[PDB]
């Protein structure tokens, strides 16, 4: 009968919308039934509570408190707690952002926080949840969280225990009392499931020991009202050990019996403690799994006699799921081709269960480190109780490489230190490595190329193609210039997947023109018989050398991006066949080892070392450029890069075809005109380098962050002695014939492997060197 009335001020669910929301539909015979209906439904809707029946004439006229709906939660207070559990416990509490606000639910989140603390352990229920209806539609929720409490749990209440020393048990456990000053290995803390796990710790412990009546029964939790001194008590019910002299088994495995018989081949004296035969059962388990099963039901049910202490074990042994074979599949292959990943696999359809297959595929993936969710899904392919589908996940990141150095040559032709790596180029089935250091007058050009396959038997399309025209130009180039040019390309049929002595082709010739005026250079050419000069840097050598070499490589590594189980081994040795200017016997040696010193593995010790020596044509000095430089760069830092060992002394020279005046420090146009102390370290013919360092998570970053960020600390030790050296002329200057060039320095190294930036920030503070080593203070690597 109503007009769905006038409102000088209506805003929300309205004249009509409110008209019907309450039992006040225009056109109704309304009774007080409807009035109470209005009142209650107003409370009820959980969108609006300013509840009344205020009729002018009899027309409802209202001061409103318009508050729809929940709008501003304010998770006030989050100490080590995040706002997300607050939000999730919020919808758990039945309200949320976007929820109808029924002011009823309030205390729940109090509880929703309060009780929450329990599941952590530590409990300080301080849950200040206050709501401010802001009167147009807005709501501001103040969610003030006080929980001052810790799970610092040390009640080693270990009782029922008279077989294994309480302390031994403690050592089994994760609640100790002292922080080592030698290594972080201790535990003291809580969770319900830490509880259970430790329960099993001691339990497995016992039953393993051969216990067969051991159980645990006492669990009495207590905390002081101060909420920190956490004492909880536990007791057990021990078992009985045994000695074993009895055995039974029943097999329906189709034909592997006396292979078990003598596969164990015990004789009449051997002791009961159970996990021994648990590994006997694993024996026969994977025995059949390889034979061609997947899921036989096989148990070893024991007995309990002490009335003669006489125990006999029985085993039921099924045959299992022989032949479930279906195609393999992939997921997460998105820029890689199916075919290349299939080139990875070694699996074969049309067989029976092989763990070795799938798990090796896992690891082969792990090797790659471009992309990682190493997932072999091998469920029963539905239906036809005859088969099993095979399917595979991986998670990827855009991974690509380039290294160079800052400057210089932006004032000049845009100068390039261009070493660039697609690593999706193996997405071409083969990967090429390229870096040229096309420096103003240093034209370094290399080629590295590998398809892992000429042929799948292991032969890998591996080639190394070299030239540099090197000039070394600041004010001239006739100090020296090289057309230097050589290629080494592999050939090997690696029959064992860790044995390789191979026979690839190794050649260089170089054109060496107008070399430098330094004493080693002179005597080396004298050694070549090519007696060198006295005042220029102008001379000739055309070097043509012929290689017969063998070398062996052995690497077991898990993770491709970042291993943990690091054992990588690479050895080269060159016996140089004649027509080579030097028939050098060159030995080059390098190893690296991650030992993940923990099973969380966050803690990995890294040791890396390298030998380099040349013994070849006893009868020549060495064609020099086979030299060793190392130090002060990354394997060592704080010092000049690759500067160690033997120095570089100039000889009085007055040309190079123009070495310029105001020249090298001495023995030339600058300073001293005669032989002098020109000490510029270059190293000798036996080099040795090694880093001794540790790797540890900065956990102050997200699991993603540390997944991309690595933090370690190094001791960087190197020495290089020239086996062929003088004291007679070095009657005043230092010498090299055995490891004495040992130094000290340590550094902090930080690397973030962000997809576009692999980032190196280092502070290695140099704390020992020798003569010829210069200081290095601040620069930020690649």
């Amino acid at each position: 009968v109503v007009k769905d009335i006038h409102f000088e001020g209506l805003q929300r669910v309205a004249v009509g919308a409110a008209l019907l929301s309450m039992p006040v539909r225009t056109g109704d015979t309304v009774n007080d039934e409807d009035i109470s209906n209005t009142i209650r439904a107003l409370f009820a809707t959980g969108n609006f509570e300013d509840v009344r029946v205020l009729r002018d004439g009899d027309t409802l006229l209202v001061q409103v408190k318009e508050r729809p709906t929940i709008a501003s939660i304010t998770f006030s207070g989050n100490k080590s707690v995040k706002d997300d559990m607050l939000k999730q416990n919020l919808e758990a509490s039945g309200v949320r952002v976007g929820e109808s606000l029924d002011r009823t639910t309030i205390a729940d989140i109090e509880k929703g926080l309060e009780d929450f603390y329990y599941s952590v352990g530590k409990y300080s229920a301080s849950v200040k949840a206050v709501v401010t209806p802001l009167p147009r539609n807005r709501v501001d929720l103040k969610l003030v969280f006080q929980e001052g409490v810790s799970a610092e749990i040390q009640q080693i209440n270990i009782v029922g225990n008279h077989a294994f020393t309480t302390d031994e048990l403690i050592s089994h456990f994760q609640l100790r009392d002292e922080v080592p000053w030698w290594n972080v290995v201790g535990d003291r803390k809580y969770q319900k499931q830490k509880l259970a796990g430790d329960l099993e710790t001691l339990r497995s412990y016992y039953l393993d020991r051969g216990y067969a009546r051991f159980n645990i029964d006492s669990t009495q939790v207590s905390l002081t009202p101060d909420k920190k001194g956490i004492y909880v008590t536990v007791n057990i019910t021990e078992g009985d050990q045994y000695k074993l002299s009895g055995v039974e088994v029943s097999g329906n495995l189709a034909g592997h019996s006396a292979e078990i018989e003598q596969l164990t081949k015990i004789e009449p004296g051997e002791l009961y403690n159970g996990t021994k035969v648990t590994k006997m059962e694993d024996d026969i388990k994977k025995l059949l799994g390889r034979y061609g099963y997947a899921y036989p039901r096989v148990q070893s049910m024991p007995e309990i006699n002490d009335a003669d202490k006489t125990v006999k074990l029985r085993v039921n042994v099924d045959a299992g799921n022989r032949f479930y074979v279906r195609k393999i599949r992939f997921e997460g292959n998105d820029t890689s081709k199916d075919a290349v990943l299939r080139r990875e696999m070694r699996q074969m359809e049309g067989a029976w269960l092989g763990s070795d297959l799938v798990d090796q595929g896992k690891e082969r993936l792990n090797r790659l480190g471009f992309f990682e969710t190493v997932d072999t899904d091998t469920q029963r392919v539905p239906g036809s109780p005859d088969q099993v589908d095979v399917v595979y996940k991986v998670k990827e990141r855009n991974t690509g490489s380039f290294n160079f150095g800052i400057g210089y040559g932006t004032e000049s032709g845009v100068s390039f230190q261009a070493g660039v790596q697609q690593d999706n180029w193996l997405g071409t089935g083969y990967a090429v490595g390229i870096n040229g250091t096309k420096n103003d007058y240093q034209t370094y050009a290399e080629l590295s190329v590998t398809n892992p396959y000429f042929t799948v038997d292991g032969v890998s399309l591996g080639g190394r193609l070299f030239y540099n025209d090197f000039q070394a130009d600041d004010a001239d180039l006739s100090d020296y210039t090289n057309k230097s040019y050589g290629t080494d390309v592999t050939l090997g049929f690696p029959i064992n997947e860790y044995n390789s002595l191979r026979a690839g082709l190794g050649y260089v010739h170089n054109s060496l023109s107008n070399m430098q005026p330094q004493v080693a250079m002179w005597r080396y050419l004298y050694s070549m018989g090519e007696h060198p000069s006295t005042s220029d840097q102008d001379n000739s050598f055309k070097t043509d050398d012929f290689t017969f070499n063998y070398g062996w490589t052995y690497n077991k590594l898990d993770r491709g991006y970042f291993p943990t189980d690091g054992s990588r081994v690479n050895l080269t040795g060159k016996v140089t066949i004649p027509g080579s200017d030097n028939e050098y016997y060159k030995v080059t040696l390098d190893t690296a080892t991650y030992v993940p010193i923990d099973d969380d593995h966050k803690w990995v010790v890294l040791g890396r070392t390298r030998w380099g020596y040349g013994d070849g044509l006893g009868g020549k000095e060495m064609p020099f450029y086979e030299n060793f430089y190392a130090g002060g760069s990354s394997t060592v830092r704080g010092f000049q890069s690759n500067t160690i060992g033997p120095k570089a002394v100039y000889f009085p020279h007055q040309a190079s075809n123009y070495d310029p005046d105001y020249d090298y420090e001495c023995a030339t146009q600058d300073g001293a005109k005669d032989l002098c102390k020109s000490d510029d370290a270059v190293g000798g013919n036996a080099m040795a380098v090694a880093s001794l360092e540790f790797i540890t998570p900065t956990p102050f970053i997200s699991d993603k962050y540390a997944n991309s960020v690595r933090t370690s600390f190094f001791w960087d030790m190197g020495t290089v002695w020239d086996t062929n050296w003088d004291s007679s002329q070095y009657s005043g200057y230092p010498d090299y014939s055995d490891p004495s060039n040992i130094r000290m320095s340590a550094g902090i190294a930080l690397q973030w492997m962000s997809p576009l930036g692999p980032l190196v920030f280092s502070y290695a503070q140099p704390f020992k060197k020798y003569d010829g080593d210069k200081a290095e203070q601040f620069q930020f690597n690649i």
């Binding site: 067989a351 005859d386 042929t455 032969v459």
Partner: protein
């Protein structure tokens, strides 16, 4: 290298035993689930079935065991196909 190759298999092994478990004819369902997966699914026509194991172990030995049956009905056969290495 024509000298060596890593060994070669096409498995799901068997023997004249489960063969003896089997004979001329019984429903394509039963035997189909009995001797295992149908190794070579005839596409078209003849329900021609091909239990063949293949083995090439490294330049001295072999096993090409080939089997074929025909089930053109409720699962009826009169088909002989067994042979060792070839």
């Amino acid at each position: 290298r024509v000298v060596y190759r890593p060994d070669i298999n096409q498995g799901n092994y068997l023997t004249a035993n489960d063969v003896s478990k089997i004979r001329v004819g019984m429903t394509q369902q039963q035997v189909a689930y009995a001797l295992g997966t149908p190794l070579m699914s005839d596409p078209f026509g003849t329900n021609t079935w091909f239990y063949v194991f293949r083995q090439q172990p490294g330049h001295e030995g072999v096993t090409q065991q080939t089997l074929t049956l025909t089930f053109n009905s409720s699962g009826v056969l009169t088909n002989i196909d067994n042979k060792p290495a070839l």
